[PDB]
Amino acid sequence: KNSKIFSPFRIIGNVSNGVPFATGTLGSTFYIVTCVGKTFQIYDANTLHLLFVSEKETPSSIVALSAHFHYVYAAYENKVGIYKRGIEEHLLELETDANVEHLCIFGDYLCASTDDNSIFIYKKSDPQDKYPSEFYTKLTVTEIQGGEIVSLQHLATYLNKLTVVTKSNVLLFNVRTGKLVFTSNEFPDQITTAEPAPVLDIIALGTVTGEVIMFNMRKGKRIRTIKIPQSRISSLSFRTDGSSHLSVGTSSGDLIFYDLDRRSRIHVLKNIHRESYGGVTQATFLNGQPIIVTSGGDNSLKEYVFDPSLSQGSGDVVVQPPRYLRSRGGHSQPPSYIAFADSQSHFMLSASKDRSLWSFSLRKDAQSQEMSQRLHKKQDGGRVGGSTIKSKFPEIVALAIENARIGEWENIITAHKDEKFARTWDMRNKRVGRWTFDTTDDGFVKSVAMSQCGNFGFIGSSNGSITIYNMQSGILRKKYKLHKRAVTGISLDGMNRKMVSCGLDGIVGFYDFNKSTLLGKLKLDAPITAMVYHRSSDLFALALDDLSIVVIDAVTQRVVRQLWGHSNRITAFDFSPEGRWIVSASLDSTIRTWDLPTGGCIDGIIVDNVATNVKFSPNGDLLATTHVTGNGICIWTNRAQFKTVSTRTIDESEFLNDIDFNTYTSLEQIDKELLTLSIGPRSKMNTLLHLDVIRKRSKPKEAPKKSEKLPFFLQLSGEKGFESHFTKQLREGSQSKDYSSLLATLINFSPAAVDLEIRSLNSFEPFDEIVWFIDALTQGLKSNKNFELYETFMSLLFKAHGDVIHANNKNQDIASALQNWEDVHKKEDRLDDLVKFCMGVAAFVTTA
Amino acid sequence: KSDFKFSNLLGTVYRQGNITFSDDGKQLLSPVGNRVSVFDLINNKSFTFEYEHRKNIAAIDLNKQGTLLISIDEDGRAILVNFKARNVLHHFNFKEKCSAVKFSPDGRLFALASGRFLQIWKTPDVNKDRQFAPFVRHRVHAGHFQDITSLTWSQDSRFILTTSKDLSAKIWSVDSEEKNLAATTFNGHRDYVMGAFFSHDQEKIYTVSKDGAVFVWEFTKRKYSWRITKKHFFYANQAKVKCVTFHPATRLLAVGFTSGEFRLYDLPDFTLIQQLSMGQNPVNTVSVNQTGEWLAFGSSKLGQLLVYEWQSESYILKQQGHFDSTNSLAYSPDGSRVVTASEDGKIKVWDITSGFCLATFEEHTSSVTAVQFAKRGQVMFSSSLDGTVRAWDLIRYRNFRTFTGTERIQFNCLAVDPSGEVVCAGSLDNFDIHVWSVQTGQLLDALSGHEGPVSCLSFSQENSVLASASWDKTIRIWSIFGRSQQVEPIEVYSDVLALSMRPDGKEVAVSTLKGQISIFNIEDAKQVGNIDCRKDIISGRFNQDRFTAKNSERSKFFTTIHYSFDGMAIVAGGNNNSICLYDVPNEVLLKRFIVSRNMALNGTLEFLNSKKMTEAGSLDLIDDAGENSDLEDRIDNSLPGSQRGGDLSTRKMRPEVRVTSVQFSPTANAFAAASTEGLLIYSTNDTILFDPFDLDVDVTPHSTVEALREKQFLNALVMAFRLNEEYLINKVYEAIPIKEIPLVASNIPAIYLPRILKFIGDFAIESQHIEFNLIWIKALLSASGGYINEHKYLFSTAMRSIQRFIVRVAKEVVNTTTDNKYTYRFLVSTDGSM
Amino acid sequence: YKLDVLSSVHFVPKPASTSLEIRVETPTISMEDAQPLYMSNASSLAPQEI
Amino acid sequence: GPYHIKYAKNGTHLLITGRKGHVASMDWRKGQLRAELFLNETCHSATYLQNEQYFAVAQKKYTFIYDHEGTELHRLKQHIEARHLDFLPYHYLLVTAGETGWLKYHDVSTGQLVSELRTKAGPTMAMAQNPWNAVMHLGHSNGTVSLWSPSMPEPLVKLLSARGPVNSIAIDRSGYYMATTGADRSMKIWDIRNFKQLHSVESLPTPGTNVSISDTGLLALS
RNA sequence: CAUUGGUGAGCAGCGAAGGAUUUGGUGGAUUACUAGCUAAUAGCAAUCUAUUUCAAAGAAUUCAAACUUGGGGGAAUGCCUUGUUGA
């Protein structure tokens, strides 16, 4: 399940799963450490932005969390991981084979408590360390001392002592030595929570019936008891602003505030978290403020405040009810359909099976909103009629969007479940749009589509019909009938020209659309389960029923590719943005990437949790999939955006180089007779011809004013043989009659160096050097590469030594060498023949 | 056909920020408005990165392996880019207005001076695939008392020198082992500290101050610690330093003063090596290449980039662009040059591939409103509010004529005949189309008859008729040559404001003020289709607006239009944030391009921010020139309400995004649009999109390779053209042999002829096999000439690309070979010397 | 100049001009602008003018 | 912007300037707000001038003298770029000291610029007045303070105070001591009559950004 | 006959333990998410001070200094620049 194209990135749209979150002051300010399965996320408690995210996904889920100033401790399967700023700073493996339930850190000691009633104590090596690492000892709870351990606490001012609240009593250990210095008398109920009060000595214990016992530990006796009847207490927090309040958070969602000075009940808050997914799992008063933060396993996190009184003197007898400050959330239930809204890959719609349609943000996870369903005033002058107690729309099972008219009329169509119309939604205002789109033959909308131009919305039904509606006006325009069984995909071309529809009678019907003809009818084997069209290239992919993908060219109207290799039904799938790949996820828990040129699988991932939607981003950075369990969207990167990706078939093994990297490096020289030029730049020829005039243009217009004492050998003294190398190489070339090495050097000089050398040839009586250079050039034009630069060098030679060879003309050696030069060159005037013909006939063909 | 990516940004060479050389010494990265460009000085090749900041850039640095690039705009919003593959890795915003970033020369960790804090972070790894947060903090140091301003590492990257507006400088170690080695601070400057550098082996330190003074610090006895050994001073009148650099291997100090001078000093002795005037405007930045001998100056006011070769004094390049001040463009009749007509008075011929101005003409005085080439490459005619319309040669570079008015009106559009002997121009002043004759520079006629100023003119280049259009709400088709002098008007619904003639010469598309493009037929007078546009146009809100953008009808129309060279598309662009590309037969649009996302332009956001608007009024609209620390940055000349004329700060308003003028490319698949920040050049890759043609089941890359290896070369080629994959076509193209080229070229199909021509053009301008290409072209024209001649318009661009290849790159090789031949014949036949 | 910038250029032009000026024989590469390539070659006077 | 306080000499009213345009004049004990201006050029400082009835604010360039309600009375032309304002209130002289480095005494009762002195040592970094004496101590970027007077073109006395520029000076009510603070992290107590420094503190941990000597000789440093 | 002008009394039709206009307040978004303070390689966050001082380093234009002015005539006395008498 390591893959070769996609790699996992993060999982958007999770906030809490129901492990009690932990809080941490940092200076004057607060943060909130929640855990989402195998990660933990850290939120600015003042405004709830996403500061940090755990860096690597822990091996199992996180059992316990605790935080302190800069450090945050998570206790997953067996171990405790100490993290600072997200990155893992210490592992701490506990010498056992039993999971770590609870965890409390106080002073020098970290205290972890397993499930078979044992307490491991890790002590700092020296108190100038910042988190403990020496194993100290291992305190154990024998069954006669107490029941199972429920929580670990450390009350204030208790030197080296640890308050272990078990299911029947409370113990006090002296963790430095470890003698059980105290046992409490057995409570006649089950203890469920514990939490220490901002008065001394006192721990507040919440039992399994509605009974909160304020229990004084120095004396060992109860001082108060408070009865909620018939609730399951699940949270306790002590408001410490100065007003003596208490919030008991039941496991039904009630959050009940008591006033402990006046023995009263201040308030209740009812259904702030859902009864099913756990109720109120943690509910804390931030230390010093009238702010409570509550968090529950329905993937939501909330913040409630206390406004001050209305009354001047009477004060704290008139208590204002606590209102609602701020919150984040996600879906409660796993998601149902996802779709990228816009082509910067910013926003993502996603509908979920608690009937709620969120729009998530990939950049900043505070920009994500839920798209509200508050209907518009009916346009007829009538009454819209539904049950007066409101409930969310049925589960949104198809969804199609266009961004071309955003702001002027609606641009989402959604298709709900067991429901007979579609609803236009908005995306600018984020709200239910004003039109509902019927199907007009009593058939449940099975799939929907939108035109490119954003004017028209097609709604294929389940008795074959196709209805087309204007979206500015919601008003019905056309209605085709070609299928007789259900219609499971609709599509339209970007020229508003050709419409395609695929339906369970194994028919793909092609229509014209400007006029209303029927343009073709293709028949496949099996029912057709999904259509994805791809627009820029006019190709589309039909997930058939016989466990096959069939790609069809929507212009020539015929089946072009047939991708076998799946093994169970195909859930969902998507073309690449560039039309080249298909990702397809299927119910045998695999995701495969297919290449359409080579028509074959080039990648596959086997997933522990079945994937049920798969969607590229349009600007092709990411792949977002969504899974059968777990509320989120899993986001994946794209190594083909950063690298090279080999295309080869693999599925046999798991479950040439030119083509395989689809890139071809051009040849050097095709035939020996065929000409070439120099590979490199093209203005090399022209600078080598006009090197002088160019530099004289470049020189600055005045003269630069310099000093008078200039240390003459500066080109030397920027700090840190006999014959020149080129002339040497030329000479040995003339000795061995092979100038290959010389021509390597002249191809790979620079224009200055070339001109310098060709000026710096010897030019006196036995003209050995001019003869040898001309021989090298002849050999080069014979070898027939670099026609460009050998001609250029000969032109430079005639410029810089035309005088000496014009004078010492009819010397035999120069006569002979120049004749051999003329041999090869008069063979090579055919090039001028070709060019003259090419633009003679080309300009004629163009002008006439 | 309709897949266009941001190819390039032409017409701007430097805007603001910081200029860097590559690791090689070859390429040059320099920040244009909110994008970095890479100008490749050796292989003469340019580009512009695709990613865009939401405000102007202010710091860049490039890794030492040439691999990562960090660019920070103002307000700390860094973007990390993978330089090899040109695709953004990670956005990360440091809150403050950050002032410099330097990678470590090891390339392990990068230091960043933000505010008064020094944050040293570690790089990510370029091999590791992406993640949520890959920047891992190393330290944050906090010595200074006011801003840092500069930042310099060691050569062995473990000590960092920061200079700051504190009037000071500090050394920070990088290990808390070596804190004791580096805890000291430096002192004594009077004004600021604009640089502090190390020596070549780090036993001396230099500190350069805005007051004009260089201190030389050395660890020495009267224990003993870090005295000031020497003080040297520049002596400017009132220039101050604005940017300092030090190449330590050669010990140069290059200092850019605020007056226009720079001086190259030799530092451990302080001798003046050199001194030159760049311009007259403050030099804003300096860099040097690696080996120490291409300097790189940049001056943001007026926007000029300069690269110097200080050994033998020679500008390797001396260039300058136009912010906001361009009124039009027009391509060369070959897709390689582009002409821009600027509001200054300057016409610049800009190369395309390497974005550098070949030539600059400045004979106009006031702004230049229209440019056209002739149907030649020789002359171009240019029209400006001078009152004259001037003709330019482009071989000897001269005004060979200036047609003038008869009372000097302000000319605002230009149009010139195919056989370039008649020039018409029309103004917004007079509503009479003047017609001059080129040779006798007198004016033939004043074609009159509009009632309302002329907004465009054009010449049907086939039938030679002058169709013009005016705010009259009409079009008039004048037929000027040949005893007729008859004229035919057309009423459009409303107030027309740009025009475009088909290539063919039968149709006129006309972009009006209510927001349609109405496409008429000229032989008749009848409207063969319009396309309604007012909606798909993104007008933003200005900060100085008090009305919603959905009502703001500042910009709901297209002031520029252009057909394709095929007859099928119209690009239109306007006074707004979007360029829209329509298809002409189907009347339905293909793509909408957004010119910029740059919140330092006004028309660019759709919805403003309510955190900004308050009781005072808006919040981006206060004055902060008082906050600036410098007299020339406080001085605010602005003649009140001067809507778009004069220099950029001769008005107190922020620029507006607009497309001043749009054209297609006459050779390639591209188009180009002159707008506020330059000329956006948008173009295409078949080598990325999978757009097959006429496929079937049995056509794979494996099958076509098999068809080569058993030698059915025709079939292998047509399978390549059906699959439509660029490497494949190249592969077969070079496989097939020279004897077999003519039969294949005869037997190719008619449908695939245009594609093979397109491929030969794209390979041909930059490849080397000139015999292979020219043999192919000769065979292709030879065996299918007449068909092309019939279908003249599908092949407009394809044959122009081949013809550019022949006259541009083959023809010189012919010239030099022929020159050489005749020189030999002279030298060896002539009379011997003496 | 100030009055043109104030009036946001829509003015009326100068009356006229015709004033003699002198040009030199010079190569076109020495005339154009400084950057690694070149574009034109022929000398700046014409053969008939020499 | 960052704000700037000025309590009226009387004790009652207060004037706060922003740095963007927000000026406001209030009473602070009765809470009643006298005036409020949202002018958008960067204001620097303000003073009351004699009553609560008049105030004068610096601005981007000029000096504007407003009423008790913010109706602008005058636009002082000749005080170009006054980063510092003060009012010496028995002589009725509004005093600005610039960024030009010119020092202007302006009689706000008859409307006639008394004196226009040239402090040549550059843009004035700090400024305070001897109240027992009404003589202006301007502190200059050399590190030297200088005492002026309107009827003397030359500084009455120059006082080499710090190394590097002089951030802020503040003078006793009794007219007999001056504390000055400087950008080389320094603070010096001078005895103005007899002109000897009493005693000086030479390493503060970060520069003394301001000082003030109260109405009881107590010292505040910030 | 119109009314495309008001003000009302009434139906058909829509229609689940109600509906329709108007308005105050707070929360979240509006730019792409790396936590707080300080004297900052660290400490604090229940506290910086009863080590918070030392040592070192640190002093050009011997005064470049309004690049900062609406136009036209001027200037007693000021100011300013150049000369000068007596110390």
Please write out the topology:
The structure is cut from a larger assembly and holds chains A (848 residues), B (834 residues), C (50 residues) and D (222 residues).
Chain A: E1 8-12, E2 22-26, E3 29-35, E4 40-44, E5 50-53, E6 62-67, E7 71-76, E8 79-84, E9 87-93, E10 100-106, E11 109-114, E12 118-123, E13 134-140, E14 149-153, E15 162-166, E16 170-173, E17 180-183, E18 191-196, E19 202-207, E20 211-216, E21 221-227, E22 233-239, E23 245-250, E24 255-259, E25 264-269, E26 282-285, E27 291-296, E28 300-306, E29 322-329, E30 335-340, E31 347-352, E32 356-361, E33 369-370, E34 398-401, E35 412-415, E36 421-425, E37 432-438, E38 447-450, E39 456-460, E40 465-470, E41 476-481, E42 487-492, E43 498-503, E44 507-512, E45 518-523, E46 528-534, E47 539-544, E48 549-553, E49 558-563, E50 570-575, E51 581-586, E52 590-595, E53 600-606, E54 611-616, E55 623-627, E56 633-636, H1 639-642, H2 651-654, H3 657-660, H4 684-689, H5 691-698, H6 725-736, H7 740-747, H8 751-759, H9 768-783, H10 787-807, H11 812-827, H12 830-847
Antiparallel strand pairs in A: 1-56, 2-3, 3-4, 4-5, 6-7, 7-8, 8-9, 10-11, 11-12, 12-13, 14-15, 15-16, 16-17, 18-19, 19-20, 20-21, 22-23, 23-24, 24-25, 26-27, 27-28, 28-29, 30-31, 31-32, 32-33, 34-35, 35-36, 36-37, 38-39, 39-40, 40-41, 42-43, 43-44, 44-45, 46-47, 47-48, 48-49, 50-51, 51-52, 52-53, ...
Helix pairs in contact in A: 6-7, 6-9, 8-10, 9-10, 9-11
Chain C: H1 2-7
Chain D: E1 4-7, E2 14-17, E3 22-26, E4 33-38, E5 46-48, E6 55-58, E7 63-66, E8 72-76, E9 84-88, E10 93-97, E11 103-107, E12 112-117, E13 126-130, E14 135-140, E15 144-147, E16 157-160, E17 166-171, E18 178-182, E19 186-191, E20 196-201, E21 211-213, E22 219-221
Antiparallel strand pairs in D: 1-2, 2-3, 3-4, 5-6, 6-7, 7-8, 9-10, 10-11, 11-12, 13-14, 14-15, 15-16, 17-18, 18-19, 19-20, 21-22
The structure holds one RNA strand of 87 nucleotides.
